[PDB]
Design a protein around this ligand. Structure first.
Ligand SMILES: O=c1ccn([C@H]2C[C@H](O)[C@@H](COP(=O)(O)NP(=O)(O)OP(=O)(O)O)O2)c(=O)[nH]1
Ligand SMILES: O=c1ccn([C@H]2C[C@H](O)[C@@H](COP(=O)(O)NP(=O)(O)OP(=O)(O)O)O2)c(=O)[nH]1
Ligand SMILES: O=c1ccn([C@H]2C[C@H](O)[C@@H](COP(=O)(O)NP(=O)(O)OP(=O)(O)O)O2)c(=O)[nH]1
Ligand SMILES: [Mg+2]
Ligand SMILES: [Mg+2]
Ligand SMILES: [Mg+2]
Lengths: 137, 152, 148
């Protein structure tokens, strides 16, 4: 079940020094996002930093959304997760994709340029319309 | 894809003191949930508090569920997120929707009545039927997990 | 709506000492997962431990994934959540299902053999192929719509 998604490269290192995001294995649900940075960033325990990806997507189909998630190795082994926990990307967002990286653990961690620091899945979504009732029975 | 969902305005402040939940933009995936409180609540760093939404929904369709999530601005800038991280709402749950608000950050934060403090999406769900096997049809990923594909 | 998932039992207690995961009601979205431990694990505030389930699943269909989540009661009342926040099980994984348990709260907590410590849903997923373009809410994000 494939879907074409338009993407605009904002930093010319993307697609060259920093490969475009890809699925690590053929049945992976998420694609890995890379940190678009000149220099490594040291995250002390408790600190948050906003990491640019250097690209923008336009999902455009209002029956689809994306969810940014931590990776399980970074999250479990190093406490490197997301500051907003889960990042919900709307179908009508055109801006640069940004990653809120938060050190939830006890050890300092150093994010390298180009590192695969989070992942992103695409999921069908349903828009609800409310039917106001006085009681459900 | 639009679906009509029954909702009971369990707390009549919702729709009167502050607006009913709606989709912030046309192409928004989630709808914002508001703090149904009589008094402001100051959350010190590390603290949690249980905030009512004033709403009960009945999805009723077992092929659908809802998920409650933090908002990205409150979460990234102020460390205001969920105490259970992600809230899962069953299709046959029709009690009040409650929000566990947790201050994961280093500065205190005051939740005001009516404030949009989290968001909710509706997603399709599949119910699994387990088939016991002796061997798997092996794959390239195999048993690999927890960072086996590397950092770079 | 329903999908057949291959499962292998790795610990003989699973299905004998305590049940295999089951949907509690016909309208339940998730299945509860039980800690398959020999000895209870003490978790100080801020600690993380990796908890086996005694089970391996193989979803096998690349338009489907599973998401592991905290339970709302354990999360809100005791701060017992997931160390990777949300656990994403891929269609081509067939290792042991493992739960990263993190004590995010201010009080110690002990993970007990057999305790229902997390839950898991299965959701459809779509794999994307990129189309490079020069030009395409607008660009508004991270709070732009306000809170009032
Ligand atoms: O909570 C979890 C998360 C993942 N897993 C396993 C199954 C999943 O398919 C595999 C990899 O998941 P992620 O891709 O989300 N994490 P990461 O990218 O760090 O690992 P990998 O390098 O193997 O892809 O780890 C668990 O058993 N429990
Ligand atoms: O953030 C939440 C999460 C759940 N809920 C409601 C809806 C859901 O259907 C119900 C049960 O969710 P969980 O299974 O996550 N909680 P728990 O397992 O602790 O309680 P139960 O024993 O009733 O399943 O609680 C909320 O109001 N807010
Ligand atoms: O991790 C994220 C989350 C969101 N975003 C962008 C895309 C999304 O469409 C937009 C808004 O997301 P939320 O609605 O979850 N956050 P918030 O409600 O604070 O911002 P807004 O007022 O713009 O809706 O922000 C990111 O770039 N990274
Ligand atoms: Mg991975
Ligand atoms: Mg928003
Ligand atoms: Mg439950």
């Amino acid at each position: 079940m494939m879907k074409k998604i338009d993407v605009k490269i904002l930093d010319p290192r993307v697609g060259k020094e920093f490969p475009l995001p890809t699925y690590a294995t053929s049945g992976s649900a998420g694609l890995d996002l890379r940190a678009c940075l000149n220099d490594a960033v040291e995250l002390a325990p408790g600190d948050t930093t906003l990491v640019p990806t250097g690209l923008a997507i336009h999902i455009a189909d209002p029956s689809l959304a994306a969810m940014m998630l931590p990776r399980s190795g970074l999250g479990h082994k190093h406490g490197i997760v997301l500051g907003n926990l889960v990042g919900l990307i709307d179908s009508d967002y055109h801006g640069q994709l940004m990653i809120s990286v938060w050190n939830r653990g006890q050890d300092s961690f150093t994010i390298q340029p180009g590192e695969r620091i989070a992942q992103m899945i695409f999921v069908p979504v349903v828009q609800a319309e409310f039917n106001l009732v006085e009681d459900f029975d």
